[PDB]
Amino acid sequence: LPPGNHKLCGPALSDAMDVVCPHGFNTLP
Amino acid sequence: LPPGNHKLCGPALSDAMDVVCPHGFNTLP
Amino acid sequence: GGVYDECCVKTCSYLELAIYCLP
Amino acid sequence: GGVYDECCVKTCSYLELAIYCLP
Amino acid sequence: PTMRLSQNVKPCKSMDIRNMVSHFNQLENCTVIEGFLLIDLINDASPLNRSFPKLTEVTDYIIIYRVTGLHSLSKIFPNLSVIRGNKLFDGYALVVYSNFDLMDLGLHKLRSITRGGVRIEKNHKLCYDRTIDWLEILAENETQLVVLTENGKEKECRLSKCPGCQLHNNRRLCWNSKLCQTKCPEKCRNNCIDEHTCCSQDCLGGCVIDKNGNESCISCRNVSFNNICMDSCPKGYYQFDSRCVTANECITLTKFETNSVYSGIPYNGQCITHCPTGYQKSENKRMCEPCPGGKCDKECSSGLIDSLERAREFHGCTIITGTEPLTISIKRESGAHVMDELKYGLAAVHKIQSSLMVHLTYGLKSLKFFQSLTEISGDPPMDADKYALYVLDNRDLDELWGPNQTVFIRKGGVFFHFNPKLCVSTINQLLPMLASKPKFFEKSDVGADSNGNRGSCGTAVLNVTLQSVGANSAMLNVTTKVEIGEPQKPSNATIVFKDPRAFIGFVFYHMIDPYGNSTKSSPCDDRWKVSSPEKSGVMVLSNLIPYTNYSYYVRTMAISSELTNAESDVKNFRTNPGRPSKVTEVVATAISDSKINVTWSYLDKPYGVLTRYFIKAKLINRPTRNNNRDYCTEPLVKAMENEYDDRKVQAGMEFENALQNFIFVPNDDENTYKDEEDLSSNKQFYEVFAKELPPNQTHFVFEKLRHFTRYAIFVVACREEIPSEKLRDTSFKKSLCSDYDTVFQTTKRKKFADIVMDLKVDLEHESPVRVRWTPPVDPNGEIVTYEVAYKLQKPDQVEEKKCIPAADFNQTAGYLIKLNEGLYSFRVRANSIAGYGDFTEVEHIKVEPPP
Amino acid sequence: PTMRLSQNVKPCKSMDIRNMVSHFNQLENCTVIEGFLLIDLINDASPLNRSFPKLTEVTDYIIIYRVTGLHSLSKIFPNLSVIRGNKLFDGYALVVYSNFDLMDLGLHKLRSITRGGVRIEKNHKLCYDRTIDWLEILAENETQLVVLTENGKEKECRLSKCPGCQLHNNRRLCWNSKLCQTKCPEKCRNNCIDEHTCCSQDCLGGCVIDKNGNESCISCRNVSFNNICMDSCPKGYYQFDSRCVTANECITLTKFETNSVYSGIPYNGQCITHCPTGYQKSENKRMCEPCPGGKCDKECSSGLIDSLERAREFHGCTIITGTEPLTISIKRESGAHVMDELKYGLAAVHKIQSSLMVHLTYGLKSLKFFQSLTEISGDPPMDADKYALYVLDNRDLDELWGPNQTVFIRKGGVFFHFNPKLCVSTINQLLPMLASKPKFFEKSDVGADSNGNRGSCGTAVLNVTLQSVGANSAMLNVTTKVEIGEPQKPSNATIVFKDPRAFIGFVFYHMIDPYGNSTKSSPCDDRWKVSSPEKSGVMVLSNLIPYTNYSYYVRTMAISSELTNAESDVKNFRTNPGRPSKVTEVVATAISDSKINVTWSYLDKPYGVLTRYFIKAKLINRPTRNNNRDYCTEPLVKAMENEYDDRKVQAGMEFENALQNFIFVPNDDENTYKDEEDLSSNKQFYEVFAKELPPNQTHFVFEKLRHFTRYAIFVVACREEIPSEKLRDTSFKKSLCSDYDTVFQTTKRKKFADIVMDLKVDLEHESPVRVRWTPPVDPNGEIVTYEVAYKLQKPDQVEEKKCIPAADFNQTAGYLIKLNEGLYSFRVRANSIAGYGDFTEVEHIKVEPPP
Ligand SMILES: *[C@@H]1O[C@H](CO)[C@@H](O)[C@H](O)[C@H]1NC(C)=O
Ligand SMILES: *[C@@H]1O[C@H](CO)[C@@H](O)[C@H](O)[C@H]1NC(C)=O
Ligand SMILES: *[C@@H]1O[C@H](CO)[C@@H](O)[C@H](O)[C@H]1NC(C)=O
Ligand SMILES: *[C@@H]1O[C@H](CO)[C@@H](O)[C@H](O)[C@H]1NC(C)=O
Ligand SMILES: *[C@@H]1O[C@H](CO)[C@@H](O)[C@H](O)[C@H]1NC(C)=O
Ligand SMILES: *[C@@H]1O[C@H](CO)[C@@H](O)[C@H](O)[C@H]1NC(C)=O
Ligand SMILES: *[C@@H]1O[C@H](CO)[C@@H](O)[C@H](O)[C@H]1NC(C)=O
Ligand SMILES: *[C@@H]1O[C@H](CO)[C@@H](O)[C@H](O)[C@H]1NC(C)=O
Ligand SMILES: *[C@@H]1O[C@H](CO)[C@@H](O)[C@H](O)[C@H]1NC(C)=O
Ligand SMILES: *[C@@H]1O[C@H](CO)[C@@H](O)[C@H](O)[C@H]1NC(C)=O
Ligand SMILES: *[C@@H]1O[C@H](CO)[C@@H](O)[C@H](O)[C@H]1NC(C)=O
Ligand SMILES: *[C@@H]1O[C@H](CO)[C@@H](O)[C@H](O)[C@H]1NC(C)=O
Ligand SMILES: *[C@@H]1O[C@H](CO)[C@@H](O)[C@H](O)[C@H]1NC(C)=O
Ligand SMILES: *[C@@H]1O[C@H](CO)[C@@H](O)[C@H](O)[C@H]1NC(C)=O
Ligand SMILES: *[C@@H]1O[C@H](CO)[C@@H](O)[C@H](O)[C@H]1NC(C)=O
Ligand SMILES: *[C@@H]1O[C@H](CO)[C@@H](O)[C@H](O)[C@H]1NC(C)=O
Ligand SMILES: *[C@@H]1O[C@H](CO)[C@@H](O)[C@H](O)[C@H]1NC(C)=O
């Protein structure tokens, strides 16, 4: 989690999105 | 016999040789 | 740019990647 | 060079090819 | 006609159901969605305490990505009917993606999809989805966008049986077994409210009979105004997708696009987001007006395009600039709307300052969508600035530009490899368009065998002639004379080869094909059997099975370095009739002692036309009396027993050249038969019986045959004859009738006929009694002994019986039997190969010896 | 030590038989050929009336090209024995090419070839092509170059009879139809005068022995002087290829070379036509002198190389210059001497001003022969100055410049494609060579897919571990933990994939191999069966044949664009014993009334090892007496009567990326048994019999059974048990012994034995007569009736007999018969379900009642 390079891809990226911040997202408009 | 290009090759070359030169070959040495 | 622009091509850090999910 | 160098590549004429003859 | 649509609509702009279910409170009262509707990242949809039947219609598309805690889509889409697809997300119109909790779709009222298609992915628990016929619900012309995957199909999703409506089309079609698909008849294809209640062409998405008994559209097909359907909007109103609004309203309308929001511009009766060709937005953005110089130029930095959605961003851009190449890398499955989305995204560009590149695309049929392109300036090329047009690994690319389309190339070199469907000739058409005007492309830049190898395009045609055919053999003949060696007077059926050796020989293929449509071989395909290379140009197919249609085709085989390839069309022909096969399941059985029956079938190939069936029956002699047996001391009943090869020729050629360079120096039977029967001299029975039968028959009876006898059965099936055979084949070859196997008959009830007759007795004087009898007309089996019985006409007297081996009692006028005083009766029966006969009636004799 | 050579030498220089027969006179008197001997374009060799037995040895080679009218080589080569190949034309020492009239070689005296191989081609009439064991004649190490083709061997050569010398090594090595090759033992290989008679190593090809003991060599192996053999020449002389010569003789000597004649130079004890490296010929060309600066900078124009013989022209050249590239295009088959010849022809070159190129070569293992090469100037690089080292289509090239070799490159780019064995890693070793010092080669220059596809170079290894095995199943588990995404502290036995989706999954191959030597799959090879891709890393082999060895190996499957490949070694393992199969060909037979025999084989797989055989015999008795019978009227004798694979993934990946880019936004069987036989109640016989047998057996007999019985035979084979099956598992699920099939042998074993005995007769008071008898020891097959007979002791009387249903006569103490006056004898026998017995002996009674 700490390191900042992390060539993150695909499903790993999707799951990391949730684990990093499950509260919510901005929505498009 | 007439044409000047006549790209002879392989067995055709030898066959044309042994007739266009029907009587002898001057040997190497 | 988009997520696939900053991550999964080149490389991105989590703390920078947190921008997508502000409250 | 020889026959295969003079003919069958950069094809030659029969008249020139006669050089390989006349013992 | 013009009429009211069901209910009054309250359209609302796109909605974003995100994070938590509470945002559903923004979706109520929305009859239709003026844009797209996306549901993403609901951690738990179970708390949904409502359904929204009012929502019926959506304009752009539906994506359900990573929604969790939702079992079916019915709860949120009770009445979702149609997806107009005015906008596409990567070309798809309904996407249901990566959901762990979706059991069933629930789209009961889904009725029509206008554009794009459907993608369903990574929904493990979804079922019944693989039942619906997506091709019927989509637009008829391009129904290919129906992709689905990993819907738990392996073992767990076997409960998709549907109500098996049940098994229509031999398949289930249901949104869970609770329901089944609402198919429509072809007369109103997907334009019905039920399987027989069609709908008018004015409506789209369905129609409901109103309280007045008249139709009411679910949604207007062309446009809608004041809840009424019409073809076009009234004056002063502009079409915004599915309804007409004033200019003032259109100014307020908006649609989201690629991290941007574009307001609607009332133009030419339509509410528009991007001005049409030759137009640019006004300074106030309230209208479009003609562009100066015919078209406003616009510049966009070059960048990769890994999918259609990215391509949409380049809409309306005339100039692509920057050192970065415009790397197209689309990867579709099947040729979906890519050809049209890319057209929308790039039809405007007319010249590129950078260099184009098409690395690794799938489903990209051509670069024809660069409609306005005129010049690839290629100012900064790439790859050490070597190349200005770089095409690579395009698994489905087959043609570069539009027909006779001219586009300049100002710099750099072209590049082409691994494009299986790109024929080489199509590449060379660029030769007159480069700045350097190369006469030909060097092998370093343009591949030789890696391009177009899969395209039946570069094949010179051979005029194969089928010479002669036979029972099992056929001869082929390649008519096209070959220009081997000098090209002296070319164009004589060229098929040229620069030297006699490079051409190793012709290759013939053949394979059994009653349908005559086998495709040419691709490299493990084993359908075709091949023969070794042949140089003379004639081959003799052998060991063919008679009268079988064989597909065959020819091609030239040459050393890999040579490239003057040619082929032939896949012609086909049939062998000759040959000889019919043996009859199958032949059995003989009795009807009576003289009526006999035979059964057979023909479950093997007849090889031709079965002109007739032939059966021949002939008897065999019975065994005679044998002296190695005893009779009447032991009873007798006796039921009847009745490769590439490249290296070798290459090495030979090279060595031959090296040697030339050095040697020289300057200075039982049926061949024929006639229908007939042979009648015995006494006329009692037919010894033999040979007749024809029609091809209808499979079993027949033959009567008036000898009893107590075996009849050898011989069966045949005979074939037709070709005119060329009959006109010459007098006695040779022939073989027009099949193989056979003798069948012998276990004839039941062939015994016990004619028994014995005329029994009489007499005495010589304890006077012995001579007993006489007559043998039957036909021996009940060859007689081996005669049994004789007698009894005394007194109570409790047993009937004695004795025997004689027969044929020896006659010289005594009968069989002598010791007898005593009294009145007696006698009986006789036959003992033969068939066992005992029946005892004949009685005759009496009285004994009264005098002294 | 020291030994004479046969005959006195009269050498004649290189010879050419040309045009006409009369030129054969040039062969006069000369025993050996000091050069090469070629015969070609002799239109008709028949008029040759003589032979030339003196000719025995030829220094360089023999080529017979296009000689017509010659039947065999015996006539012109009677005693030709040794071909020493000092000069080796094109790497072939004996050539016989394109002759229509040659039938039989006739080279009886040929024994040894010192250098090069042998090529025979286009001699349609040549029979006996395959007879000779060439590999013995050639140098033992590199025997590969023996090539023969289109000799007419297909069908026409029916005269391959040969003397069967006979079929040694199942190959008749016959010269002509009658002569044959004489082999030599390894101690004197190809140096023997007959089959066993050897010769010392001083000679070559053997030696002749005479009555005087004056053994003389066929030809000296090392050198010769004054007709005597020695290792080296005496001082003051020079070695010339067979013999020692003076300085003047060397000056006069000559040899032909590539359209030139070079006179030998007497140098350092040898007469050689070329000075050694670092030396140059004198102005008078009488001696050699050291090269200035240690290197004579001779230069030659660059030009194509078509075969080895061409390469010799570059001998001694240092600088290859000219705009033309030095295109190497050698084409061998199993290149034997390519390396050495090219070394002789190019070892001198150190700097190339042009650009090298090696296009379409076969058998060119490496470029190691450029020994002295140091710098490819590439000043005019080929292909529009693009490239300075061009490589292509080299079907057998595998490695570039030799170990620790370094060469500079001043211009242009490298190029590589279609080289099967050339691994990419070996190419990348040139990265530090170029003047531009590229960090890597771009995909346009180096064909990373094509190059090295056939070489086991980049195969990263996997620690495949066999987890568990079973009767028909086994589980595989791959230990290597694959990095996905994050680098995760590399150097951990990594195997990496930069994108989780790119990794489709592992692939397990397996196949039955008792020897465990199956090679990895090439593309139509079907030995290996392969399971579907798997991602977890564990697979469960199923349905294996028990106790069968299986080879398996693991490969990683990734989308084609990905390139992080890995594999495993071909490990081998065997399944468990399983259960043995049925016994084959089981038959039972009766030896006597109490002794039985059984025969069987085991021609099916036992699996495991057959610890023991076991047989169980059970007696199953007949049913009781049946009333559906009649006696004395129905008697019985009663014998016995009983693909893309990636498009889907690629499309999924791209669509996933596009969707991600948009969603987010910033802000009755033997269960158990033991040996046993059960006695009858009276212990007269064994009711059942069950015993183990040793695995030696195939047939055995069983003893002390009772007469006339149905002993059902049950047979089985039992396998071993693995320790884990007996200590890690207990006595349940058994499966220890095979399936079985009952064998029945219900014969009338074997004699009459006993039917009835102890008959006696009495009478009640023509008084009725009572007959008594005793039943047999055991029923002769379930006695059903008794046949009772009597006769009168008077002439012409016959025996009368009756029947009873048994067990009824006892009520009267015997069967009662009405009998008249006289003396009578009585007999009785039982009849059973097993048929008749034999009538017991007689006993007499006389009737004499009083009134
Ligand atoms: C909006 O929906 C609510 C139900 O949540 C309903 O009570 C209200 O009447 C609706 N208003 C309109 C204008 O449709
Ligand atoms: C359903 O939930 C909404 C809020 O999300 C609330 O306004 C409404 O009263 C609820 N209705 C029922 C029946 O629970
Ligand atoms: C050039 O091609 C276009 C379509 O690509 C076609 O409409 C036009 O007629 C063509 N012109 C000629 C001269 O063939
Ligand atoms: C071979 O057939 C094709 C098509 O039938 C025809 O166009 C061609 O002229 C034929 N070739 C010859 C040499 O007749
Ligand atoms: C058929 O083959 C023969 C040679 O086998 C040839 O002479 C003839 O021309 C061929 N047929 C045709 C129509 O060319
Ligand atoms: C086989 O070919 C002949 C013509 O050569 C055709 O009449 C026949 O229909 C073909 N066989 C079948 C099964 O169609
Ligand atoms: C083509 O042949 C295949 C079998 O090879 C057959 O299944 C198919 O029906 C045929 N179709 C036509 C149009 O002949
Ligand atoms: C039986 O054969 C006759 C010709 O003899 C034919 O007309 C008739 O159709 C056949 N029967 C059937 C059922 O085809
Ligand atoms: C007798 O032959 C007829 C046809 O010829 C058939 O239908 C019937 O089954 C046969 N009966 C027997 C007993 O073979
Ligand atoms: C061999 O040479 C001698 C002279 O030295 C000559 O007389 C003789 O004829 C030659 N051999 C033959 C077979 O002629
Ligand atoms: C045989 O040939 C030789 C030449 O090699 C010649 O001298 C001699 O006269 C010939 N003999 C006959 C009988 O022709
Ligand atoms: C087993 O794994 C180790 C790394 O821990 C590796 O070095 C070794 O090569 C592997 N086994 C084989 C046979 O390569
Ligand atoms: C595979 O083996 C490793 C150790 O070699 C072990 O840690 C792992 O649990 C095994 N995997 C399975 C599925 O048993
Ligand atoms: C099978 O492999 C085992 C070792 O696992 C070995 O002992 C056995 O010999 C192999 N089978 C054969 C037939 O060699
Ligand atoms: C494996 O080795 C055995 C040794 O007897 C040999 O017979 C067999 O051909 C070999 N198989 C392979 C595929 O190398
Ligand atoms: C009979 O038994 C003997 C051993 O007692 C055996 O060798 C022989 O093969 C058996 N033969 C038959 C026919 O059972
Ligand atoms: C027969 O079996 C015994 C074990 O009982 C064994 O010692 C012997 O070697 C076997 N016979 C042969 C010929 O192997």
CA-E50 nearest atom, ligand 2: 1
Element (H, E) at E225: strand E223-225
> Is F444 a member of any domain?
no
Chain centroid to CA F428: how far? 38
**Measured distance CA(F405)–CA(F369) in Å, rounded:** 11
**Measured distance CA(E298)–CA(E302) in Å, rounded:** 13
> E830 forms bridges with which residues in the sheet?
E786
**Measured distance CA(E794)–CA(E806) in Å, rounded:** 30
List Cβ neighbours of F771 (8 Å cut-off, separation of 6 or more). Answer: F759, F760, F761, F788, F790, F814, F815, F817, F826, F828
Enumerate neighbours of F (3 or more CB pairs within 8 A).
A, B, C, D, E
| Phi, psi angle pair for C14, to nearest 5° | -55, -50
**Measured distance CA(F175)–CA(F162) in Å, rounded:** 8
F832: amino acid identity, one letter: S
CATH number at residue E773: 2.60.40.10
Give the nearest partner residue to C3 out of F499, F661, F667, using CB atoms: F661
Using only C-alpha atoms, what is the Rg of chain A?
11
Cβ-count burial of E448 within 10 angstroms (0-12 exposed, 13-18 middle, 19+ buried)? middle
8 A C-beta contact, residue F700 and residue F615:
yes
E76: amino acid identity, one letter: I
Pocket of ligand 4 (CB under 6 A): E 461, 463, 480, 493
List Cβ neighbours of F660 (8 Å cut-off, separation of 6 or more). Answer: A13, A14, C2, C3, C4, C8
Domain span at E510? 460-574
Residue where a domain stops, chosen among F428, F445, F477? F428
| Vertex E385 angle, CA E384 and E391, to 5° | 100
CA distances from F709 to F458, F617, F687, F705, F786 (A): 75, 12, 10, 8, 20
Q: How many CA atoms lie within 13 A of F605 on its CB side?
A: 9
> E466 forms bridges with which residues in the sheet?
E476
Pairing of strands F584-590, F571-574: unpaired
Task: Look up residue E115 and give its two tokens.
Answer: 């554009």
Task: Look up residue E96 and give its two tokens.
Answer: 């249901």
List Cβ neighbours of E171 (8 Å cut-off, separation of 6 or more). Answer: E131, E133
Residue where a domain stops, chosen among E532, E555, E574? E574
| CA E534 / ligand 5 centre spacing (Å) | 15
> Is E620 a member of any domain?
yes
Q: Spell out the SS3 assignment of F46-92.
A: CCCCCCCCCCCEECCCEEEECCCCCCECCCCCCCCCEECCCCCHHHE
> F830 forms bridges with which residues in the sheet?
F786
Pairing of strands E351-352, E319-321: parallel
**Measured distance CA(F30)–CA(E408) in Å, rounded:** 76
Using only C-alpha atoms, what is the Rg of chain D?
8
> Is F265 a member of any domain?
yes
Phi-psi region of E148 (alpha: psi -120 to 50; beta: other; left: phi over 0): beta
> E791 forms bridges with which residues in the sheet?
E825
Q: Do B7 and E501 touch (CB under 8 A)?
A: no
Clarify whether residues F235 and F305 are in a common domain. no
8 A C-beta contact, residue A24 and residue C18:
no
C to D contact (≥3 Cβ pairs closer than 8 Å): no
8 A C-beta contact, residue E452 and residue E428:
no
Phi-psi region of E825 (alpha: psi -120 to 50; beta: other; left: phi over 0): beta
> Is F250 a member of any domain?
yes
Element (H, E) at F589: strand F584-590
Element (H, E) at E278: none
CA distances from E190 to E81, E137, E199, E200 (A): 11, 7, 9, 11
8 A C-beta contact, residue E449 and residue E562:
no
Residues F293, F298, F299, F300: what is their CA dihedral angle, to the nearest 10 degrees? -160
8 A C-beta contact, residue E265 and residue E286:
yes
Got the DSSP string for F507-531? Answer: EEEEEE-SSS-PPPP-----S-EEP
Ligand 9 neighbourhood includes E701 CB (under 6 angstroms) = yes
**Measured distance CA(F654)–CA(F196) in Å, rounded:** 78
Clarify whether residues E260 and E276 are in a common domain. yes
> Is F442 a member of any domain?
no
Nearest-CA distance from B14 to chain F in Å?
Answer: 10
E640: amino acid identity, one letter: M
**Measured distance CA(E346)–CA(E313) in Å, rounded:** 9
8 A C-beta contact, residue A14 and residue F660:
yes
The count of structural domains within chain F is 7
DSSP secondary structure letter of residue E431:
G
Q: Which of F19, F59, F52 is nearest to F37 (CA)?
A: F59
| Phi, psi angle pair for E478, to nearest 5° | -90, 115
Token look-up 């000759």 returns E576
8 A C-beta contact, residue F68 and residue F92:
no
Got the DSSP string for F314-347? Answer: GTT--EEESSS-EEE--B-SS-SSHHHHHHHHHT
**Measured distance CA(F416)–CA(F277) in Å, rounded:** 33
8 A C-beta contact, residue F459 and residue F566:
yes
Clarify whether residues E326 and E411 are in a common domain. yes
Clarify whether residues F189 and F312 are in a common domain. no
> Is E537 a member of any domain?
yes
Residue where a domain stops, chosen among F530, F558, F574? F574
List Cβ neighbours of F371 (8 Å cut-off, separation of 6 or more). Answer: F343, F346, F347, F402
Query: Nearest chain B Cα to D3, which residue?
Result: B13
**Measured distance CA(F219)–CA(F11) in Å, rounded:** 13
8 A C-beta contact, residue F826 and residue F843:
yes
Q: F19 and chain D: CB distance < 8 Å anywhere?
A: yes
Q: Which of F664, C6, C4, F654 is nearest to E91 (CA)?
A: F654
**Measured distance CA(E796)–CA(E784) in Å, rounded:** 32
Clarify whether residues E324 and E414 are in a common domain. yes
Give the number of residues written for chain F. Answer: 851
Q: Which of E697, D20, E272 is nearest to B8 (CA)?
A: D20
Token look-up 């929305």 returns E30
H-assigned helices in E610-728 = 646-663, 723-726
| CA F846 / ligand 9 centre spacing (Å) | 67
List Cβ neighbours of E715 (8 Å cut-off, separation of 6 or more). Answer: E583, E586, E598, E600, E613, E614, E615, E740, E743
**Measured distance CA(F31)–CA(F217) in Å, rounded:** 14
**Residue whose CA lies nearest to ligand 15 atom number 5:** F515
- The ligand that comes nearest to the alpha carbon of residue E527 is 7
Q: B7 and chain D: CB distance < 8 Å anywhere?
A: yes
Q: Which of E817, E809, E838, E727 is nearest to E769 (CA)?
A: E817
Clarify whether residues F105 and F206 are in a common domain. no
Q: Which of E637, E559, E603, E616 is nearest to E829 (CA)?
A: E637
Could you tell me the end-to-end alpha-carbon distance of chain E, in angstroms, rounded to an integer? Answer: 138
Using only C-alpha atoms, what is the Rg of chain E?
48
List Cβ neighbours of F538 (8 Å cut-off, separation of 6 or more). Answer: F467, F475, F476, F477, F478
Clarify whether residues F95 and F63 are in a common domain. yes
Q: Which of E40, E45, E56 is nearest to E22 (CA)?
A: E45
Token look-up 């004789």 returns E788
List of chain B residues whose C-beta atoms are within 8 Å of the C-beta of residue F18: 24-25, 27
CATH number at residue F91: 3.80.20.20
| Vertex A1 angle, CA A3 and A18, to 5° | 135
Q: Spell out the SS3 assignment of E137-200.
A: HCCHHHCCCCCECCCCCCCHHHHCCCCCCCCHHHCCCCCCCCCCCCCCCHHHCCCECCCCCECC
Q: Which of E391, E392, E382, E439 is nearest to E412 (CA)?
A: E382
Residues of A with CB under 8 A from a CB of E: 14, 18, 22-25, 27-29
| Phi, psi angle pair for E272, to nearest 5° | -120, 145
Task: Look up residue E563 and give its two tokens.
Answer: 């490239």
Chain centroid to CA F246: how far? 56
Clarify whether residues F148 and F84 are in a common domain. yes
Got the DSSP string for F477-499? Answer: EE-PPPEESS--SS-SS--EESS
> Is E713 a member of any domain?
yes
**Residue whose CA lies nearest to ligand 3 atom number 4:** E403
Query: Nearest chain E Cα to B8, which residue?
Result: E485
| CA E506 / ligand 5 centre spacing (Å) | 15
| CA E482 / ligand 6 centre spacing (Å) | 32
- The ligand that comes nearest to the alpha carbon of residue F693 is 17
Clarify whether residues E591 and E564 are in a common domain. no
Clarify whether residues E729 and E765 are in a common domain. no
8 A C-beta contact, residue F26 and residue F4:
no
SS3 F290: strand
8 A C-beta contact, residue E409 and residue E436:
no
Task: Look up residue E670 and give its two tokens.
Answer: 């049926």
CA distances from B9 to E252, E501, E661, F68, F223 (A): 82, 9, 12, 21, 44
- Residue E533's CB: how many other CB atoms inside 10 A? 16
Clarify whether residues F199 and F122 are in a common domain. no
Task: Look up residue E783 and give its two tokens.
Answer: 């007689």
8 A C-beta contact, residue E58 and residue E89:
no
Resolution (A): 3.9
Pairing of strands E408-409, E529-530: unpaired
8 A C-beta contact, residue E803 and residue E788:
yes
Token look-up 């409502």 returns E50
**Measured distance CA(E119)–CA(E98) in Å, rounded:** 11
Element (H, E) at F661: helix F647-663
> Is E663 a member of any domain?
no
Peptide bond before residue E109 is cis, with ω within 30 degrees of 0: no
Query: Nearest chain E Cα to F447, which residue?
Result: E417
Q: Do E660 and D3 touch (CB under 8 A)?
A: yes
Query: Nearest chain B Cα to E654, which residue?
Result: B10
**Measured distance CA(F462)–CA(F555) in Å, rounded:** 9
Task: Look up residue F778 and give its two tokens.
Answer: 């055991």
* Structural biology method used: cryo-EM
Helix and strand tally (H, E) in chain A?
1, 0
Clarify whether residues E262 and E344 are in a common domain. no
Give buried/exposed letters for E144-179 (b at 16+ CB in 10 A, else e). Answer: bbbbbeebbbeeebeebebeeeeeeeeebbbbbbeb
Q: Do F18 and B24 touch (CB under 8 A)?
A: yes
Give the number of residues written for chain E. Answer: 851
| CA E549 / ligand 6 centre spacing (Å) | 6
8 A C-beta contact, residue F203 and residue F221:
yes
**Measured distance CA(E242)–CA(E222) in Å, rounded:** 7
CA distances from F302 to F327, F368, F410 (A): 8, 19, 18
Task: Look up residue E301 and give its two tokens.
Answer: 């930095």
Q: Point out residues after which chain D has a gap (C–N over 2.5 Å).
A: none
E345: amino acid identity, one letter: G
